[PDB]
């Protein structure tokens, strides 16, 4: 919450009390909490009436330090899943001189929720089979579409993991988030076409065109019609078998049963084989683009920019050769529909390729492999989000897809909503230049720089992994999609129990708002202890200060117990800084060591390797200091139930008292080194007895003093020196300049932020790369009013927002269970 | 205290309740109370870390009447003991075209705390002496360094006064305050080199050079090496005798015993004869200068200004011929060390004079007189404040010097910290011009103009006395420094019991802050009744209005009872306006009528003769009206525990209500004379029934109406006319202009005061020279919003400071009893 006076800066919760464990069961963060503040929609659903195109930013009055009120001053929503591979430089479109930002997961099978053979599986073994041991009979007890010698080779030795529908449901959770950009124009913001390319105005009118393999720079049309995989040059292979006898002799264990519940006479019914073959194989199969008509700032040069979404750059899968076994009607003996296959058509795209598809091959003979990047390229303009929604409802009737899609969905939001770093400026609204690394350099919500590609596409290098995600194995999928095994995370449901995000037009708006509390929780994690940006980068193996290696060691997921993931320590600190600070729990998955079942969130599955949230200067130079700051503060304050005390709104100037500090009555002291000219704030009592941290000590979490340090570097002329006033190794901003948010184009009657209002002031540097303590200093002449404001005998004029705090309770309808519809109050006893 | 809202303007204490008698014992005003607000030092002692050079002014935010906030706007500390005898005119140094400001005391012996012969004195009489009346023996019962016929002529008829160590301890309290300007550069402010010469920047680096008899203008090098006294051309005479038999036949009663406790093998031990001969004789012996390297505003013309401190212009003593009797070792009969004198050396300065000292004469023969202005000129570069401190500790071991030095020290502060008058301007920060009487015209803290010299130096005119101070007689000093008499103010002590100001580098900073509550108490005395400046000047003998003669008659110390000072009436009003308003008592001395012992402060020992605190206009013209206003208001408000209601901060504009007034519900009425155009505020009910005061009536103390009169002359267009709107004899400021504080040079990021913020608004004129009442008027058109603000139906936009009230409790350590030092916790039972 933002502050009305100093008596609620002072009576704000601490960090240690707000990072404690919580035993409450909390509702999921739906993204509607930020929505019902920054838009005209407070109540309920609105089809096309609510113009979300214009409602894309934080708006409010501001109050300057000089006593003036700015009327309509805006802060951008700082997250988008769209990297502009065509940049508007000099009011005209040119190709990007920048590589594409790629991520990579760490897909591996772990001990999920345990699995058990059903009464059908004990029925096949006990009866039938066991009874063929006396009758000399080799009859067929065919289950629904498969041979008895196909079920008999699967009702066998079961792996003791249990499956997690996570990788296939992130691919479904991911192509959904791509294919939901072409829904309308007044349902997708214009700010999220302007987050990186800020010299750009997209248009109401023509919607976005979600294309595939048509990006104009650095390869990236990975076979525009001769398609390969983007990660690794190769085309894969798919084969549609009717028996396991046809799978040649080599694979036969990798063979995936397509269950007959996902293909019924309810849809196109042959697109569902492509969503199944796309969920089970590999992401990405192709490099999707989003092309939209844009215009420059005044509006002359209307062209079409090419974007590439971030979730088409996430390398997940490792299954490139699929052998799919198809249900054979009711019951038939083993044999162009040889054995009564319902279908296997190619698609809708003509696809002149290496096997030369013509326009749409209908073919399910015995072996006869196709390519897989080709077979998925043909079904790349057909995957609209309504079809994905009803496919999810057909999945939900046989397995439990409610909680696993929401965990996979905020996994998508965790590694897909990606934000440009910062720019250091004095006032408000600085950005970068065009055709430069600094405009396109970009970070996660975890304050962690996204790796861009090193060489031209399709890639042979395979960069380091970023996140540990699970996967469906084919061998357990073949028996849980067939009634032969069951678990507690796999209990089936109805299509009403599909989450609200699926098949809705408002996903590109909601998913960029779900990523803001992730960066608030990581932002408050990285700012309680200020280790700049250099003592985070080369911190994993520094032989100085064993404390710092323990910090970076524990933050990441590098431990195990039995064959399963032990989640990270200190990512539960971020999770508790999410549940306490937002009163809403993030979605976990299950992992079991043995018996004991414990929970791991995207807060606990990151991996080491990679630099952190850097800040740039006005001329593009690196200012690796402060702390890993991303989005501007007011996001890390206003949209918050309980923000810890060191991060706080400087309260408005009401009477004679505006902004004060914390003095030696709270256990603090002034540093006051060698020279008489520069003095430091009221830091801790340990600050004068250190000067360099001991090899197992770090910055003590004091929010009286971190407040009191950002209270001094808001003055506008500070230097970040030393215990003795000497320089540091770290790059310092050129003046009294702070990291400030990204500037987007304005509208009519709508202003830019004024002075340290769209800034990030909380990033107080306290721990240099060398292990020495960083002190913020002022001249003796220019520190009298800050020292007396700490002593409550003066006041400091600071700028603020003129908003008020509401923070409503959760709705739990979210446009996803509108079961009030009159035709099921009467079909209600039958459920 | 400054006001948060109007409900604490209204609920402020009155004048009559705040001038009442108080029975509390209060702590002394140490000067640390102003310090712990206007500087970075709140806690404790700081050797050279704390740069007091830059921490020399009141700093804070301001709020204009137009709703704007000024960030760092400064008010100067308006007191210094340094008159610039070299003025920087046109960025370059020239000699002053102005005479030197001189004061003069009224040294006389009064009935102090009574004195009584000890057991040693009754031992000399009863035994020895009385027993020589039977034995025909003329033996020597020598006490410590003197003959028995030297003690026998002093153990005699004792005067019934008792001595007061006041004149010698003001001379010691005075040369200390001169010789503490050469301690450092970052321990003395730069504002106090800029109080009169405001076109000047002194430098960190080279310290001040405390010279002697080297001033370049109007004589003032009173014998640069042939030295005379500055007050009266003459050189004096000193003689170092060993017996009273050598003192020729003429003086012999004026002969001063030098006690052997001030000269021990602990120091130079011969400088203490010069501090003794300087305490006992005459002030000043020479005209000390303080030369410091200064630079102009931008910084080009680095030169050295010559200053003369105010306490080297205070004429105290009347003893020009000293005959000092020296202790003769243990025991020896009467006789270049003839009779075992320890020493009598000349000094360190070569001193080509009328007796022609060469460099350092060591000489104690029998009579052989030296000059005294010569003997003290040689010990004029050696009196550093550490030696003065240990000399004070050697005095404190034999007599009680704790309370008498503090009374003599705030006597020094009372008649040494001296401030330039005012300049009338509309906004903030007006000063005077260079090489003009008006820049150098200057006042006490008692709102009383300092007399400058009439003719060239050494002076034969001897101006009128300013203050009644006591003195040590030699005849009682010869027996209280010898064990023959004792009193209650003379009980001996330890060197730990020497006050904290002695020998510390921070005296020039602390003494200018001790003088601010003196001028607050006198400022609130002179403003409760507004008698302008003309009915104070020629008010002592005006045959009109017997009330006014009683005011000026009683304010000054012109009464007696028995042979001792009766202190002034109405200076106890100022003393009670000090103890009630500051919760800290000023240091008294003792005077006894007989039996009854009563107390007289520098508040009760001033003398008539002399003009009062005039105000100048922008062009230098005299504006003798208002009331004797000196320092700007915020000093007479913020640094205050309980400021009476007529002086009050106009509260800040918070909501719709900012500043209101007092109407006929509080017993007031509007004057409303002959013409319909000009109307006056809500004055008293007596204001319309007077028009001229009766010959025994004066302005009734009403703080509802004095507030309401400064509430109208803050508007910016008033005239001070009459009962009928006619002019007055007094000089009126040229427009709606008020007396405003002195402008000093600014620093980086540091502003000037804006509009009536560094002003003195409390000086409401209410009593003309003619005995007629002065009314403040507005036009009928421009008085509707003030009248309705009095009726609480409107608001007035006034400017204010954005500070807050703290006013801490006294410390009582003050860097003067750091007895916690580990080597006397173990030597603690032995004290």
mmCIF file of C-alpha atoms in Angstrom, chain A residues 59-253:
data_model
loop_
_atom_site.group_PDB
_atom_site.id
_atom_site.type_symbol
_atom_site.label_atom_id
_atom_site.label_comp_id
_atom_site.label_asym_id
_atom_site.label_seq_id
_atom_site.Cartn_x
_atom_site.Cartn_y
_atom_site.Cartn_z
ATOM 1 C CA UNK A 59 -3.002 6.223 -14.427
ATOM 2 C CA UNK A 60 -3.239 8.752 -11.646
ATOM 3 C CA UNK A 61 -2.456 12.208 -10.408
ATOM 4 C CA UNK A 62 0.984 12.998 -9.051
ATOM 5 C CA UNK A 63 2.313 15.541 -6.582
ATOM 6 C CA UNK A 64 5.736 17.054 -7.124
ATOM 7 C CA UNK A 65 8.266 18.049 -4.493
ATOM 8 C CA UNK A 66 7.615 21.690 -5.426
ATOM 9 C CA UNK A 67 3.948 21.548 -4.486
ATOM 10 C CA UNK A 68 2.391 21.094 -7.927
ATOM 11 C CA UNK A 69 -0.136 18.479 -9.044
ATOM 12 C CA UNK A 70 0.282 16.694 -12.383
ATOM 13 C CA UNK A 71 -3.102 15.664 -13.712
ATOM 14 C CA UNK A 72 -2.916 12.470 -15.791
ATOM 15 C CA UNK A 73 0.560 10.960 -15.512
ATOM 16 C CA UNK A 74 1.035 7.369 -16.588
ATOM 17 C CA UNK A 75 3.268 4.408 -15.854
ATOM 18 C CA UNK A 76 3.514 1.580 -18.376
ATOM 19 C CA UNK A 77 2.718 -2.023 -17.575
ATOM 20 C CA UNK A 78 6.266 -3.305 -17.917
ATOM 21 C CA UNK A 79 5.874 -6.897 -19.222
ATOM 22 C CA UNK A 80 5.318 -8.428 -22.656
ATOM 23 C CA UNK A 81 5.723 -11.731 -24.460
ATOM 24 C CA UNK A 82 6.649 -10.168 -27.821
ATOM 25 C CA UNK A 83 10.170 -9.395 -29.049
ATOM 26 C CA UNK A 84 10.091 -6.978 -32.021
ATOM 27 C CA UNK A 85 12.107 -8.585 -34.817
ATOM 28 C CA UNK A 86 11.250 -5.490 -36.900
ATOM 29 C CA UNK A 87 12.187 -2.200 -35.221
ATOM 30 C CA UNK A 88 10.885 1.230 -36.241
ATOM 31 C CA UNK A 89 14.060 3.332 -36.483
ATOM 32 C CA UNK A 90 13.651 6.905 -37.690
ATOM 33 C CA UNK A 91 9.833 6.611 -38.108
ATOM 34 C CA UNK A 92 10.347 3.730 -40.611
ATOM 35 C CA UNK A 93 10.646 -0.040 -40.261
ATOM 36 C CA UNK A 94 14.023 -1.786 -40.456
ATOM 37 C CA UNK A 95 15.186 -5.261 -39.498
ATOM 38 C CA UNK A 96 16.517 -5.883 -36.011
ATOM 39 C CA UNK A 97 20.269 -5.854 -35.490
ATOM 40 C CA UNK A 98 19.770 -8.121 -32.464
ATOM 41 C CA UNK A 99 19.635 -11.842 -31.759
ATOM 42 C CA UNK A 100 16.517 -13.599 -30.469
ATOM 43 C CA UNK A 101 16.063 -14.233 -26.753
ATOM 44 C CA UNK A 102 15.837 -17.970 -26.068
ATOM 45 C CA UNK A 103 15.193 -19.964 -22.911
ATOM 46 C CA UNK A 104 15.724 -23.642 -22.160
ATOM 47 C CA UNK A 105 14.150 -25.937 -19.586
ATOM 48 C CA UNK A 106 15.599 -28.962 -17.797
ATOM 49 C CA UNK A 107 12.992 -31.648 -18.599
ATOM 50 C CA UNK A 108 13.482 -34.774 -16.452
ATOM 51 C CA UNK A 109 11.198 -37.293 -14.769
ATOM 52 C CA UNK A 110 10.776 -37.022 -11.012
ATOM 53 C CA UNK A 111 8.810 -38.821 -8.287
ATOM 54 C CA UNK A 112 5.360 -37.291 -8.617
ATOM 55 C CA UNK A 113 2.143 -38.286 -6.804
ATOM 56 C CA UNK A 114 2.174 -42.127 -6.591
ATOM 57 C CA UNK A 115 0.244 -44.308 -9.006
ATOM 58 C CA UNK A 116 -1.695 -47.553 -8.567
ATOM 59 C CA UNK A 117 -3.275 -50.201 -10.796
ATOM 60 C CA UNK A 118 -7.062 -50.002 -10.981
ATOM 61 C CA UNK A 119 -9.759 -52.667 -10.861
ATOM 62 C CA UNK A 120 -9.665 -52.841 -14.661
ATOM 63 C CA UNK A 121 -5.947 -53.649 -14.605
ATOM 64 C CA UNK A 122 -6.456 -56.261 -11.893
ATOM 65 C CA UNK A 123 -9.397 -57.495 -13.971
ATOM 66 C CA UNK A 124 -7.262 -58.053 -17.083
ATOM 67 C CA UNK A 125 -4.599 -59.944 -15.130
ATOM 68 C CA UNK A 126 -6.774 -62.019 -12.794
ATOM 69 C CA UNK A 127 -9.473 -62.841 -15.339
ATOM 70 C CA UNK A 128 -9.048 -63.421 -19.088
ATOM 71 C CA UNK A 129 -5.230 -63.625 -19.160
ATOM 72 C CA UNK A 130 -4.800 -65.898 -16.137
ATOM 73 C CA UNK A 131 -7.700 -67.965 -17.477
ATOM 74 C CA UNK A 132 -5.969 -68.495 -20.849
ATOM 75 C CA UNK A 133 -3.439 -70.609 -18.918
ATOM 76 C CA UNK A 134 -5.766 -73.632 -18.836
ATOM 77 C CA UNK A 135 -7.938 -73.428 -21.958
ATOM 78 C CA UNK A 136 -5.264 -73.498 -24.751
ATOM 79 C CA UNK A 137 -7.025 -70.391 -26.092
ATOM 80 C CA UNK A 138 -5.432 -67.229 -27.468
ATOM 81 C CA UNK A 139 -8.605 -65.099 -27.616
ATOM 82 C CA UNK A 140 -8.741 -61.295 -27.679
ATOM 83 C CA UNK A 141 -10.113 -59.396 -24.678
ATOM 84 C CA UNK A 142 -9.739 -56.033 -26.593
ATOM 85 C CA UNK A 143 -10.560 -53.069 -24.382
ATOM 86 C CA UNK A 144 -11.780 -50.138 -26.468
ATOM 87 C CA UNK A 145 -9.701 -49.718 -29.622
ATOM 88 C CA UNK A 146 -6.594 -51.833 -29.176
ATOM 89 C CA UNK A 147 -5.574 -55.490 -29.374
ATOM 90 C CA UNK A 148 -5.434 -57.720 -26.335
ATOM 91 C CA UNK A 149 -1.729 -58.112 -27.126
ATOM 92 C CA UNK A 150 -1.428 -54.316 -26.982
ATOM 93 C CA UNK A 151 -3.057 -54.047 -23.560
ATOM 94 C CA UNK A 152 -1.188 -57.148 -22.363
ATOM 95 C CA UNK A 153 2.195 -55.501 -23.048
ATOM 96 C CA UNK A 154 1.139 -52.370 -21.121
ATOM 97 C CA UNK A 155 -0.597 -54.001 -18.148
ATOM 98 C CA UNK A 156 2.943 -54.838 -17.016
ATOM 99 C CA UNK A 157 5.758 -53.505 -14.819
ATOM 100 C CA UNK A 158 4.884 -49.972 -13.718
ATOM 101 C CA UNK A 159 7.467 -47.298 -12.883
ATOM 102 C CA UNK A 160 7.336 -46.013 -9.294
ATOM 103 C CA UNK A 161 7.133 -42.310 -10.198
ATOM 104 C CA UNK A 162 3.580 -41.450 -11.163
ATOM 105 C CA UNK A 163 3.199 -39.088 -14.084
ATOM 106 C CA UNK A 164 3.019 -35.314 -14.083
ATOM 107 C CA UNK A 165 1.033 -33.754 -16.922
ATOM 108 C CA UNK A 166 3.357 -30.772 -16.952
ATOM 109 C CA UNK A 167 5.455 -30.648 -20.118
ATOM 110 C CA UNK A 168 2.564 -31.448 -22.475
ATOM 111 C CA UNK A 169 0.312 -29.091 -20.532
ATOM 112 C CA UNK A 170 2.887 -26.299 -20.679
ATOM 113 C CA UNK A 171 3.057 -26.833 -24.449
ATOM 114 C CA UNK A 172 -0.745 -26.643 -24.481
ATOM 115 C CA UNK A 173 -0.443 -23.729 -22.033
ATOM 116 C CA UNK A 174 2.046 -22.107 -24.402
ATOM 117 C CA UNK A 175 0.659 -22.444 -27.918
ATOM 118 C CA UNK A 176 -2.576 -21.148 -26.382
ATOM 119 C CA UNK A 177 -0.736 -18.012 -25.293
ATOM 120 C CA UNK A 178 0.663 -17.635 -28.811
ATOM 121 C CA UNK A 179 -2.598 -18.296 -30.670
ATOM 122 C CA UNK A 180 -4.520 -15.862 -28.457
ATOM 123 C CA UNK A 181 -2.957 -12.798 -30.110
ATOM 124 C CA UNK A 182 -5.230 -13.020 -33.161
ATOM 125 C CA UNK A 183 -8.526 -12.819 -31.254
ATOM 126 C CA UNK A 184 -9.330 -9.116 -31.801
ATOM 127 C CA UNK A 185 -7.685 -5.700 -31.622
ATOM 128 C CA UNK A 186 -9.650 -4.196 -28.713
ATOM 129 C CA UNK A 187 -8.886 -7.200 -26.493
ATOM 130 C CA UNK A 188 -5.074 -6.918 -26.601
ATOM 131 C CA UNK A 189 -3.255 -3.885 -25.175
ATOM 132 C CA UNK A 190 -1.213 -1.504 -27.248
ATOM 133 C CA UNK A 191 1.351 -1.061 -24.495
ATOM 134 C CA UNK A 192 2.619 -4.613 -24.996
ATOM 135 C CA UNK A 193 3.537 -3.883 -28.591
ATOM 136 C CA UNK A 194 5.431 -0.879 -27.182
ATOM 137 C CA UNK A 195 7.412 -2.363 -24.293
ATOM 138 C CA UNK A 196 10.594 -2.917 -26.303
ATOM 139 C CA UNK A 197 9.794 -0.987 -29.508
ATOM 140 C CA UNK A 198 8.501 2.196 -27.897
ATOM 141 C CA UNK A 199 8.498 4.252 -31.128
ATOM 142 C CA UNK A 200 5.448 2.388 -32.389
ATOM 143 C CA UNK A 201 1.667 2.764 -32.381
ATOM 144 C CA UNK A 202 -0.423 -0.330 -33.184
ATOM 145 C CA UNK A 203 -3.913 0.152 -34.562
ATOM 146 C CA UNK A 204 -7.496 -0.644 -33.739
ATOM 147 C CA UNK A 205 -8.723 -2.337 -36.878
ATOM 148 C CA UNK A 206 -6.691 -5.126 -38.427
ATOM 149 C CA UNK A 207 -5.937 -7.810 -35.800
ATOM 150 C CA UNK A 208 -2.592 -9.477 -35.274
ATOM 151 C CA UNK A 209 -1.664 -12.197 -37.756
ATOM 152 C CA UNK A 210 -0.184 -15.202 -35.967
ATOM 153 C CA UNK A 211 2.071 -16.603 -38.662
ATOM 154 C CA UNK A 212 4.671 -19.343 -38.620
ATOM 155 C CA UNK A 213 8.274 -19.424 -39.950
ATOM 156 C CA UNK A 214 8.199 -16.011 -41.630
ATOM 157 C CA UNK A 215 10.625 -13.891 -39.590
ATOM 158 C CA UNK A 216 12.887 -11.698 -41.735
ATOM 159 C CA UNK A 217 16.186 -11.565 -39.817
ATOM 160 C CA UNK A 218 18.914 -13.935 -38.509
ATOM 161 C CA UNK A 219 17.477 -17.031 -40.118
ATOM 162 C CA UNK A 220 14.337 -17.614 -38.018
ATOM 163 C CA UNK A 221 12.275 -18.782 -40.972
ATOM 164 C CA UNK A 222 13.539 -22.241 -40.013
ATOM 165 C CA UNK A 223 12.375 -23.763 -43.229
ATOM 166 C CA UNK A 224 9.619 -21.345 -44.246
ATOM 167 C CA UNK A 225 8.032 -24.241 -46.091
ATOM 168 C CA UNK A 226 10.770 -26.896 -45.611
ATOM 169 C CA UNK A 227 10.462 -26.750 -41.841
ATOM 170 C CA UNK A 228 12.958 -28.047 -39.297
ATOM 171 C CA UNK A 229 13.192 -27.624 -35.557
ATOM 172 C CA UNK A 230 14.458 -24.226 -34.343
ATOM 173 C CA UNK A 231 16.614 -25.853 -31.636
ATOM 174 C CA UNK A 232 18.668 -28.387 -33.541
ATOM 175 C CA UNK A 233 18.408 -28.693 -37.302
ATOM 176 C CA UNK A 234 16.116 -31.643 -37.918
ATOM 177 C CA UNK A 235 12.620 -32.539 -39.070
ATOM 178 C CA UNK A 236 11.605 -35.387 -36.763
ATOM 179 C CA UNK A 237 9.378 -38.265 -37.785
ATOM 180 C CA UNK A 238 5.789 -39.224 -36.988
ATOM 181 C CA UNK A 239 4.095 -42.525 -37.772
ATOM 182 C CA UNK A 240 0.478 -43.498 -37.170
ATOM 183 C CA UNK A 241 0.322 -47.178 -36.284
ATOM 184 C CA UNK A 242 -2.694 -49.289 -35.418
ATOM 185 C CA UNK A 243 -0.766 -51.995 -33.479
ATOM 186 C CA UNK A 244 2.494 -52.237 -31.584
ATOM 187 C CA UNK A 245 3.476 -54.929 -34.110
ATOM 188 C CA UNK A 246 4.087 -52.300 -36.808
ATOM 189 C CA UNK A 247 6.514 -50.159 -34.730
ATOM 190 C CA UNK A 248 9.562 -51.703 -36.354
ATOM 191 C CA UNK A 249 11.636 -53.419 -33.689
ATOM 192 C CA UNK A 250 13.559 -50.408 -32.493
ATOM 193 C CA UNK A 251 11.296 -48.052 -30.644
ATOM 194 C CA UNK A 252 8.180 -49.896 -29.347
ATOM 195 C CA UNK A 253 8.449 -48.466 -25.795
#
